[PDB]
Amino acid sequence: MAAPSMKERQVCWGARDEYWKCLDENLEDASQCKKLRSSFESSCPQQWIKYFDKRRDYLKFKEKFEAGQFEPSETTAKS
């Protein structure tokens, strides 16, 4: 498991709460909540949560919360 020093208040707690109602923000589109909640429940740190989430982000960014709203890019010859 990974335990960074930068942890988020809303994102981490929200993920845990979203387990009950996904996309607790507005629930405007619960259809995409499955994927988005998956990003959130992945761990806890917003860094990776939003990193993967921002790709399919529907409700989270709909709340006018914008953080790196970019599509997946190319990957190099990584490990």
Q: In sequence order, what are the residues at sequence separation of 6 or more whose Cβ sits closer than 8 angstroms to the Cβ of residue 35?
A: 56
Burial class of residue 20, CB neighbours in 10 A (0-12, 13-18, 19+): exposed
CA 67-69-72 angle, to 5 degrees, is 125
In whole angstroms, how far apart are CA 52 and each of 26, 29, 31, 72? 20, 18, 17, 9
Rg (CA), the chain: 13
Residue 54 contacts residue 39 (beta carbons within 8 Å): no
Cα atoms in the 13 Å half-sphere on the side-chain side of 41? 14
Return the closest-CA partner of residue 52 out of 32, 35, 65: 35
Structure solved via: NMR
46: left (phi over 0), alpha (psi -120 to 50) or beta: alpha
Return the closest-CA partner of residue 54 out of 68, 38, 40: 68
Tell me the domain boundaries of the chain.
Answer: 29-65
